[PDB]
Design a binder for this molecule. Structure first.
Ligand code: P5O
Length: 275
């Protein structure tokens, strides 16, 4: 599938850089014809078939195809796609309130504050999983706010770079997400489905309530070993005034066997969440 090959700079003006990763940089932008503001994600293309730098066209097209399907208040939406010899440029909805992570470092949240964010995350993931889309990269860095200055901001899931359609219940590919947040089946290179996202939500919830990462070791291999062994506990110093039901919610997500893990629908009916 081909994208718009006119020069993006003839239609948009770029501004402040919002972030940069291994093969992508995100810049605030403004469409000349409407004055509307977006985030332009420049993804570096692979320049030879056998190279390991840049993103393969198969991977770029998959992310674009997934973004084109989704429209939900808690998920980023795609406006336009351009390309040239060096980059594919996704013109994405502007989410300017910063990461849930950076907003986390400023505060540990109360259970009402945590559940207010978490309910929006669960709503967005319920939408995705209803479409058989696994995100595969849920972590605080990929949870951003629209306006961080209100007592209860609205969040949006971003970064569909690892997302996959799961039309056979599982997909057998390597997902190189970040160790602290990936499920045991990712660590062990096993078939992957929607369940992996639910584990990631359990990790996010643990951090939201405590400010601490449940599996984090001193090295990436330690973290991955801890994940595979389900080597975590609720430290009383961090959880002493956290409700048992909040702990129960986490405990039913941080489950090694994906079949025994709470699903997205389970998580919405769990007594900690269900109104
Ligand atoms: C903040 O740090 C980072 C943010 C982003 C992405 C920001 C962003 C992404 C979108 O898809 C839409 C948007 O409005 C903003 C990428 C790498 C980073 O390191």
């Amino acid at each position: 599938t081909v994208f718009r090959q006119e020069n993006v700079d003839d239609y948009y003006d770029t501004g402040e850089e919002l972030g940069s990763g291994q093969f992508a940089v995100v810049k605030k932008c403004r469409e000349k014809s409407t004055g509307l503001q977006y985030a332009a994600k420049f993804i570096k293309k692979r320049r030879t078939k056998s190279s390991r730098r840049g993103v393969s066209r198969e991977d770029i097209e998959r992310e674009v195809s997934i973004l084109k399907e989704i429209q939900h208040p808690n998920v980023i939406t795609l406006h336009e796609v351009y390309e040239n010899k060096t980059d594919v440029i996704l013109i994405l909805e502007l989410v300017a309130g910063g990461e849930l992570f950076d907003f986390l470092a400023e505060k540990s949240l109360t259970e009402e504050e945590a559940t207010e964010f978490l309910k929006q995350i669960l709503n967005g993931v319920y939408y995705l999983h209803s479409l058989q889309i696994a995100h595969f990269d849920l972590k605080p860095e990929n949870i951003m706010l629209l306006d961080r200055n209100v007592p209860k901001p609205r969040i949006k899931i971003i970064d569909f770079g690892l997302a996959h359609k799961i039309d056979f219940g599982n997909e057998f590919k390597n997902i190189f997400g970040t160790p602290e947040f990936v499920a045991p089946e990712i660590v062990n290179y096993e078939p992957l489905g929607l369940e992996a996202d639910m584990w990631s939500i359990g990790v996010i919830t643990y951090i939201l309530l405590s400010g601490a990462s449940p599996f984090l070791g001193d090295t990436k291999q330690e973290t991955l070993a801890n994940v595979s062994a389900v080597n975590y506990e609720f430290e009383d110093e961090y959880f002493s005034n956290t409700s048992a039901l909040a702990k129960d919610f986490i405990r039913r997500l941080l489950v090694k066997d994906p079949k025994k893990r709470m699903t997205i629908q389970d998580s919405l009916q769990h007594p900690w969440i269900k109104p």
